[PDB]
C-alpha cells in the first residue's frame, strides 16, 4: 500500500532545550502517534529502555529512525495530555479520581520495578492520559536499570525534580532505587489531593518538611486531605527509606482499597 509510511506533523505537543515532541498523523490511516525529535548535536540508552516497555500504564515505543543527526522516536499518543492539567491549583481533584489515577500509577511503577527499571522523575507533568483518561508513565530520559541478572545495583546519581525527590538523594552517597520512586508517587498523590506541593525540597533546612516530620498536619496541604489518604501518605513520606512502605504494602492500605469511584 503506497503512502502508509508517510506521517504529517500537525501539532507541537512539547518543545524544550532537549528537542521537541510532535503529534504525527498517518497520511493513509489517520492513526495518531507522538514523535520525539532530537538533534543529536544518552539517546541510545533511552531507546534501549523504551524497547523493553510493554504495559497498559506506560507509553509504548513503536520504533525509531534516524536521518543523519536527527533521531525520530515513534511513541504511543496520549490525547488527554498531562495529569498536571487535571489538578486544580490549591484544590486538587475529586478524591475518587485521584484514587483511580493512583491505582494506575502504581500498576505502571510495579511493572517497571518488576523489569528492573527505575523512572527517577515521576511527577504529574510526566504522567500522561489517553482518551479514556488512562494514565501512562512517559519520558524515560532519566530512567535506568537498577536490577539485572537478579542483582540490585545501588544508585548514586542525583537526578529528578527537587520537590518530588526523596530525602536520601540529598543526604546519602548511595541509595536503593525503588523507595525513591515510591516517594515521588507519594508527592504526586499529595498534589492530586491538595493542589499544592508540600515543600520546595525534603531537607531539614526546609521549614515545611520539618513541620511534616513534626506531624503538624493542621497546616496545608495536609489539612485538605481526608484522614484515610493522609494515613497512607504518613506511610509513604517516611524519611528512612528502609522504613518507608513498599508497593506490596501500599496495595494493602485501607484507603487504597476503599470503593470510591464508579466505573465510566
Amino acid at each position: 500500500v503506497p503512502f502508509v509510511e508517510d506521517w504529517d506533523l500537525v501539532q507541537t505537543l512539547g518543545e524544550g532545550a532537549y528537542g521537541e515532541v510532535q503529534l504525527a498523523v498517518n497520511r493513509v490511516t489517520e492513526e495518531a502517534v507522538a514523535v520525539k525529535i532530537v538533534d543529536m548535536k544518552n539517546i541510545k540508552k533511552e531507546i534501549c529502555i523504551n524497547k523493553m516497555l510493554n504495559h497498559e500504564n506506560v507509553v509504548k515505543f513503536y520504533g525509531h529512525r534516524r536521518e543523519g543527526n536527527i533521531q525520530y522516536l515513534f511513541l504511543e499518543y496520549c490525547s488527554g495530555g498531562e495529569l498536571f492539567d487535571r489538578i486544580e491549583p490549591d484544590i486538587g481533584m475529586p478524591e475518587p479520581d485521584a484514587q483511580r489515577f493512583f491505582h494506575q500509577l502504581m500498576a505502571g511503577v510495579v511493572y517497571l520495578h518488576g523489569i528492573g527499571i527505575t523512572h527517577r522523575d515521576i511527577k504529574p507533568e510526566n504522567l500522561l492520559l489517553d482518551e479514556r483518561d488512562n494514565l501512562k508513565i512517559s519520558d524515560f530520559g532519566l530512567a535506568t536499570v537498577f536490577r539485572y541478572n537478579n542483582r540490585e545495583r545501588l544508585l548514586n546519581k542525583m537526578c529528578g525534580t527537587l520537590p518530588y525527590v526523596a530525602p536520601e538523594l540529598l543526604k546519602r552517597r548511595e541509595f536503593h532505587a525503588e523507595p525513591v520512586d515510591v516517594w515521588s508517587c507519594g508527592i504526586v498523590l499529595t498534589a492530586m489531593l491538595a493542589g499544592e506541593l508540600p515543600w520546595d525540597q525534603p531537607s531539614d533546612s526546609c521549614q515545611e518538611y520539618s513541620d511534616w516530620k513534626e506531624k503538624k498536619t493542621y497546616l496545608n496541604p495536609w489539612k485538605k486531605i481526608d484522614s484515610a489518604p493522609l494515613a497512607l501518605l504518613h506511610k509513604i513520606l517516611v524519611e528512612n527509606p528502609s522504613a518507608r512502605i513498599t508497593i506490596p504494602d501500599i496495595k494493602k492500605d485501607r484507603w487504597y482499597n476503599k470503593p470510591l469511584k464508579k466505573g465510566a
Partner: peptide, 5 residues
Amino acid sequence: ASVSA
C-alpha cells in the same frame, strides 16, 4: 512538516 516511518 512530515516524517517517514
